[PDB]
Amino acid sequence: LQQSLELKRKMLRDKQNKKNSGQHLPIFPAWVYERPALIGDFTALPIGTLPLASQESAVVEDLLYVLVGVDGRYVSAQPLAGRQSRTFLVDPNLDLSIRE
Amino acid sequence: GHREEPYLTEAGRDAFDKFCRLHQGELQLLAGGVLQAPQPVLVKECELVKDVLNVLIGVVSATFSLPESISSLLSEVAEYGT
Numbered sequence: 001l002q003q004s005l006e007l008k009r010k011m012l013r014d015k016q017n018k019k020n021s022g023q024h025l026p027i028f029p030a031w032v033y034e035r036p037a038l039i040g041d042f043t044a045l046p047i048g049t050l051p052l053a054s055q056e057s058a059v060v061e062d063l064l065y066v067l068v069g070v071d072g073r074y075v076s077a078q079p080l081a082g083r084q085s086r087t088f089l090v091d092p093n094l095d096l097s098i099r100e
Numbered sequence: 101g102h103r104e105e106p107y108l109t110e111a112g113r114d115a116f117d118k119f120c121r122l123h124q125g126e127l128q129l130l131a132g133g134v135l136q137a138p139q140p141v142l143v144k145e146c147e148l149v150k151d152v153l154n155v156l157i158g159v160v161s162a163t164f165s166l167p168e169s170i171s172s173l174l175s176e177v178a179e180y181g182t
Contacts, residue, residue, distance in 0.1 A: 100158050
């Protein structure tokens, strides 16, 4: 997240040197990269002890939200913000046959 | 009248469990107590078929780690899942 901002300035100097007529090449403002809400991915019951044909409906609803990036009802996006890496932590207890 | 009452090849699914239990307890007494094999029942019919279908997803029952004639029927589909 913070580390990309270095790369941009280092390259801006090189392409400013490369042309002798292109003066003051433009860039996009900082908050377009900084904000984690402008990108796609930014009480609670123990679901494991529930019957099977209710667990199935609950988990398909949560996973369908997780596909478009937004956090589900039992899946938290771990704060590994920035680069092309991301992890998710799913609710520990569920019936095993669904869980695999 | 008071109804002749069935015999032990006509009644099943209650008498099957009773007789399986009887056959089992007879066997353990005739051995000495070293032929121990818990549960002359488990599961059901439809619930057992659902469990067998789930074994193809990758789960096992309790006799493998990766009614008593169910083991012979079950091995045939368990080896398919594996």
